[PDB]
């Protein structure tokens, strides 16, 4: 054991630039599937990857 | 291929339960240091992994 001082802050959170963010209800135009358990899609002007479990397909005009 | 609706919020931030959180100034009991990137230490009761670059080992000499 030895002791040291923390000179720089360090957060245990990582950001995934490739991940599409989702709000419940956001409408997703899924664009590709089977990308290692993810689907690529887009909502509004943003696109990215996400777990398909977070969405459900629906018929565009019910 | 389809349109789906977000049925669950999803955030582009992933959490590393093994990473030791550091605040500038925190005193770190470094318990092990691999010449393999991350060092192991603890601040107060919490132990975890961290990048040596975020700490300065105290030097008895000044």
UniProtKB/Swiss-Prot annotation, chains A, B:
Domain of life: Eukaryota
Residues of the SH3 domain: 1-60
Subunit organization: Interacts with tyrosine-phosphorylated EPOR and INPP5D/SHIP1. Interacts with DOCK2 and DOCK5 via its first SH3 domain. Interacts with phosphorylated CBLB and IRS4. Interacts with BCAR1/CAS and NEDD9/HEF1.
Protein role: May mediate the transduction of intracellular signals.
Family, per entry: Belongs to the CRK family.
Protein name: Crk-like protein
Organism: Homo sapiens (Human)
């Amino acid at each position: 054991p030895v002791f040291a001082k923390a000179i720089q802050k360090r957060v245990p959170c990582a950001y995934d630039k490739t991940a599409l963010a989702l709000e419940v209800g956001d409408i997703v135009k899924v664009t590709r599937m089977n990308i290692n358990g993810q689907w690529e899609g887009e909502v509004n002007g943003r696109k990215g990857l996400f777990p398909f479990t977070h969405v459900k397909i629906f018929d565009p005009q019910n």
